[PDB]
Amino acid sequence: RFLKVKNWETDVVLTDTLHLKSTLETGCTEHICMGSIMLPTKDQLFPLAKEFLDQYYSSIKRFGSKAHMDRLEEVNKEIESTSTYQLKDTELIYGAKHAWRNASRCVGRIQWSKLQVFDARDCTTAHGMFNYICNHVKYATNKGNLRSAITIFPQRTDGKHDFRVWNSQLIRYAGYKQPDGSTLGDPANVQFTEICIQQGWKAPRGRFDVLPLLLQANGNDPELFQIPPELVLEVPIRHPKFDWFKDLGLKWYGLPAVSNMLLEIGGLEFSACPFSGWYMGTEIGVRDYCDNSRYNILEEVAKKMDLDMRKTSSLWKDQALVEINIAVLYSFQSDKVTIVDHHSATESFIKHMENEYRCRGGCPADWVWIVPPMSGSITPVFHQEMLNYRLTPSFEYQPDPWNTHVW
Amino acid sequence: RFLKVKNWETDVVLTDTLHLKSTLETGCTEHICMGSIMLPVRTKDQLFPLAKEFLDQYYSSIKRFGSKAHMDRLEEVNKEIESTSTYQLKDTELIYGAKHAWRNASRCVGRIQWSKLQVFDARDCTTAHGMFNYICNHVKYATNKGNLRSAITIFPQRTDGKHDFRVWNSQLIRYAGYKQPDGSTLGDPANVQFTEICIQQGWKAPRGRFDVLPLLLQANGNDPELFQIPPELVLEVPIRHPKFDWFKDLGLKWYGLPAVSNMLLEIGGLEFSACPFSGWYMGTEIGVRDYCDNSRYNILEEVAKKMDLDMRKTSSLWKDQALVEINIAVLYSFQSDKVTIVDHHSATESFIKHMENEYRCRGGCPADWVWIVPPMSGSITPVFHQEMLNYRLTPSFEYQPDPWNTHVWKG
Ligand code: HEM
Ligand code: HEM
Ligand SMILES: N=C(Nc1cccc(O[C@H]2CN[C@H](COc3ccc(/N=C(/N)c4cccs4)cc3)C2)c1)c1cccs1
Ligand SMILES: N=C(Nc1cccc(O[C@H]2CN[C@H](COc3ccc(/N=C(/N)c4cccs4)cc3)C2)c1)c1cccs1
Ligand SMILES: C[C@H](O)[C@H](O)[C@H]1CNc2nc(N)[nH]c(=O)c2N1
Ligand SMILES: C[C@H](O)[C@H](O)[C@H]1CNc2nc(N)[nH]c(=O)c2N1
Ligand SMILES: [Zn+2]
């Protein structure tokens, strides 16, 4: 019931008790581990509200005070009456910070308490959403000195009036299927790119076209908006040794901003809660650039390096992979756009785990996601045992809006 | 209940029904996943069902389920258990058993090979000198002058827990490590404690960086005895780089034959506590883990110095660069000397094909992603993108505690 995790490189053992708080289910059982699977009413609401308010009041050292007992009654009265309730600003901010704190798949959590929360619960239209989003993008970008932020739209009510951002990230590049059977730009975004086109967006039909926002307010049909180019910080990708690297025509955007997740706080559901931080270099260099189903540039890069591509055992893929990732980091750094390398990020995460174990009694962590997609064992997280479990407040997946929406 | 796994690169979806046959426990529950935790005397009572289940699987494999030969064997095993408290496997059942323990090893990327395994029956062995003899023969057979052949040698099973056969070595061939008075380590730091035991037992240590350790062998619950493997049987590969001529001067080498000697093999409820098995190396085992773990030989800094990379910031990726060069060197050195090795691209691609084959013919393939994904360049191998289901089947290889922790010393 008290659980130990060991770091096999340093012999540091931590004791986890925080998992006993856990409420939601993992997908695993005593007979089967599902650790590598990507996706494994009034009566329901009051327990959820109570559990949340309890941890809130405990966090401000006011557990069992009249202020606590008063607020519990007030929300209870509100649920009895309205079948929902509203969070105080303080509770909203605490909830958002903790949803990040609880994100077991996130290596960047040493930062969790520095999150700027933008309360957009007063928003009513897609134009208003567009406005809040531009303000977030400009704030978070901060001319390259990136700052973590979340913008929180109105919570789910009856579920026929959902606020949604249809985009998967606020800033992403378009994807087009071509006569060749090949794909121009980002293949991950082909379907969304089709929705935008068929919604009215005239597409430049290039390799790096910033997608338009498709914003749904109050369950209405979503609407297109171009983010002002001056608010989209992009980085041309060059190499500090290889002159020809720039000739590849590669670029990426500075601001990673997830817009398709659902924030749950005290039972309340925020279906539009775009959040942003900054990149770890591997996300772009390894996954975005080198996944076979993404920009898949390994072949073209190895060619320019004149590597022996005859045999897998020359490790030509591995050599090209390193160079690409050197280039991503060198470029962002040269242009003063915040980025973290995988060595620095994983080192920070170990330190964060240690903080959380002593301060909180644990830290839910999903090893499969935390270990970087290159050079796994030369980062400290590889050698760190992790316990994965689900705490609330949380960010959760939710299905893509087009499958759900009633036009 | 059918369970689906998806490859996210290819969209290939597979359906698992084999997990239904799993009895043993994973470590996980509905509230916690322990997928990254390294380690998450039987009576007549528990023994007959374990035997029955195994023999049913065996007779099914040979298309003789429910036959007279099947039923007679069940009867014969039952009578033998009730009168002797244990039973002996037929040669055929032992072979089938050892192969299946490999087939079922969820952490093994090399399983496409599972059915090609040479099984040496050493159950007539009685002494440590006899064990040495068996192990020498296994090493010479497996090595095959560089053309490695997978093999397992199986010593007598556990009886009362007081007469165990054990190989004290964690691998048959491995380098000594020596903790120095100044706190530095000479040789392989992973093997310091075992090295210390060998010395105390009487081994004369050459005290170098790549000293092959002596075998420490326990027969029949007796105190273990030391033996030196004849050097002519220990194939080694000096490590050099195809382009970097200074690489040879790092003084590196490795042995060709990886041979795990400290696991326990369970077949039909029987426990074989000494069952050394060997295959061949995937290159990253040596180039990434043995050479570059901070806790092992730790050669990254010295390699990067000689490559004259920018070492002042991690964001130059000097470590990642040096890592790839070392791994090229390992593969080049093995291939040039014609010692079998497989690179992680080739080995992971083969595993995916094995896995798909297993889902189709067997209804599943238990796999532990944490272990199957290579320790470098993870997402440029197809296994990174493959969902896997991890569950425990028997026959199985299992961990057991190091023997110095449990052994009753006779003196
Ligand atoms: C400050 C800089 C940050 C860095 C460098 C960082 C790093 C990462 C990385 C590399 C992943 C894996 C992404 C993938 O492979 O798809 C991730 C996952 C995640 N991050 Fe962070 N992160 C940071 C800030 C944040 C912030 C501000 C939030 C929310 C407020 C957050 C919430 C999450 C969530 C919810 C996931 C998992 C998404 C999923 O399950 O698919 N991150 N993060
Ligand atoms: C034929 C060539 C083979 C290759 C390239 C191969 C590859 C591997 C690798 C890379 C690992 C992970 C090792 C580690 O990180 O510690 C492993 C684990 C394992 N392999 Fe294979 N293997 C092969 C043959 C075999 C054979 C012949 C057996 C037994 C008959 C076997 C049984 C296992 C077991 C039981 C584990 C897990 C060890 C543990 O849990 O600590 N392997 N293998
Ligand atoms: N649907 C697909 N597969 C699939 C399945 C499950 C999850 C998934 O992506 C999630 C994982 N994760 C992504 C969102 O989470 C992220 C993304 C980036 C990220 N990176 C950062 N540095 C930050 C973003 C925001 C703050 S930090 C941090 C979190 C989005 C894709 C396919 C696509 C194309 C063909 S099939
Ligand atoms: N005691 C430690 N931690 C630890 C905890 C659990 C397991 C473990 O190592 C096992 C896992 N794994 C190893 C045995 O399994 C193997 C090993 C090598 C191997 N390689 C091959 N290609 C083959 C060998 C035989 C047939 S193929 C295949 C399987 C031995 C180490 C530490 C060591 C150093 C600092 S802390
Ligand atoms: C099947 C497997 O779970 C899947 O490929 C995962 C593995 N680990 C990951 N880790 C991160 N950070 N991001 C990912 O998208 C994935 N993909
Ligand atoms: C903590 C973690 O589970 C541990 O470091 C594992 C990760 N994956 C591994 N995978 C392999 N093949 N071998 C290992 O030793 C490890 N170590
Ligand atoms: Zn699990």
Curated annotation (Swiss-Prot), chain A:
The UniProt keywords, alphabetically, are:
Calmodulin-binding, Cell membrane, Cell projection, FAD, Flavoprotein, FMN, Heme, Iron, Membrane, Metal-binding, NADP, Oxidoreductase, Phosphoprotein, Synapse, Ubl conjugation
Q: How is it modified after translation?
A: Ubiquitinated; mediated by STUB1/CHIP in the presence of Hsp70 and Hsp40 (in vitro).
One GO cellular component term of this record is: azurophil granule
Q: What is the effect of changing residue 279 to F?
A: No decrease in nitric-oxide synthase activity
Query: Would the keyword Cell membrane be found if you checked this record's keyword annotation?
Result: yes
State the superkingdom. Answer: Eukaryota
Q: Where does L-arginine bind?
A: 169, 278-279, 283
Main subcellular localisation: membrane
UniProt key word Transferase: no
Please give the tissue specificity annotation from the record for this chain: Isoform N-NOS-1 is expressed in brain and colorectum. Found in the Auerbach's plexus of the enteric nervous system. Isoform PNNOS is expressed in the penis, urethra, prostate, and skeletal muscle, and coexists with the cerebellar nnos in the pelvic plexus, bladder and liver, and is detectable in the cerebellum.
Q: What is the effect of changing residue 279 to S?
A: 30% decrease of nitric-oxide synthase activity
Residues binding heme b: 106, 397
Q: Name one GO molecular function term.
A: nitric-oxide synthase activity
Residues at which (6R)-L-erythro-5,6,7,8-tetrahydrobiopterin binds: 36, 368-369, 382
Q: Where in or outside the cell?
A: Cell membrane, Sarcolemma; Cell projection, Dendritic spine
Q: Which GO terms describe its biological process?
A: arginine catabolic process; behavioral response to cocaine; calcium ion transport; cellular response to epinephrine stimulus; cellular response to growth factor stimulus; cellular response to mechanical stimulus; establishment of localization in cell; establishment of protein localization
User: What job does the chain carry out?
Assistant: Produces nitric oxide (NO) which is a messenger molecule with diverse functions throughout the body. In the brain and peripheral nervous system, NO displays many properties of a neurotransmitter. Inhibitory transmitter for non-adrenergic and non-cholinergic nerves in the colorectum. Probably has nitrosylase activity and mediates cysteine S-nitrosylation of cytoplasmic target proteins such SRR. Inhibitory transmitter for non-adrenergic and non-cholinergic nerves in the colorectum.
The family this protein is said to belong to: Belongs to the NOS family.
Note on domains (UniProt): The PDZ domain participates in protein-protein interaction, and is responsible for targeting nNos to synaptic membranes. Mediates interaction with VAC14.
Quaternary structure and partners: Homodimer. Interacts with DLG4 (via N-terminal tandem pair of PDZ domains); the interaction possibly being prevented by the association between NOS1 and CAPON. Forms a ternary complex with CAPON and RASD1. Forms a ternary complex with CAPON and SYN1. Interacts with ZDHHC23. Interacts with NOSIP; which may impair its synaptic location. Interacts with HTR4. Interacts with SLC6A4. Interacts with VAC14.
Q: What is this protein called?
A: Nitric oxide synthase 1
Q: What species is this protein from?
A: Rattus norvegicus
Curated annotation (Swiss-Prot), chain B:
In which residues is (6R)-L-erythro-5,6,7,8-tetrahydrobiopterin bound?
36, 370-371, 384
Report the PTM annotation: Ubiquitinated; mediated by STUB1/CHIP in the presence of Hsp70 and Hsp40 (in vitro).
Q: In which tissues is it expressed?
A: Isoform N-NOS-1 is expressed in brain and colorectum. Found in the Auerbach's plexus of the enteric nervous system. Isoform PNNOS is expressed in the penis, urethra, prostate, and skeletal muscle, and coexists with the cerebellar nnos in the pelvic plexus, bladder and liver, and is detectable in the cerebellum.
Tell me which domain of life the UniProt entry assigns to the organism this sequence originates from.
Eukaryota
Locate the residues binding L-arginine. Answer: 171, 280-281, 285
Which family does the record assign? Belongs to the NOS family.
Q: What is known of its domains?
A: The PDZ domain participates in protein-protein interaction, and is responsible for targeting nNos to synaptic membranes. Mediates interaction with VAC14.
Instruction: Give the function comment from the record.
Output: Produces nitric oxide (NO) which is a messenger molecule with diverse functions throughout the body. In the brain and peripheral nervous system, NO displays many properties of a neurotransmitter. Inhibitory transmitter for non-adrenergic and non-cholinergic nerves in the colorectum. Probably has nitrosylase activity and mediates cysteine S-nitrosylation of cytoplasmic target proteins such SRR. Inhibitory transmitter for non-adrenergic and non-cholinergic nerves in the colorectum.
Q: What is this protein called?
A: Nitric oxide synthase 1
Species name for this entry? Rattus norvegicus (Rat)
In the UniProt record, the gene name given for this protein reads Nos1
| Portion of the full-length sequence here | 299 to 718 of 1429
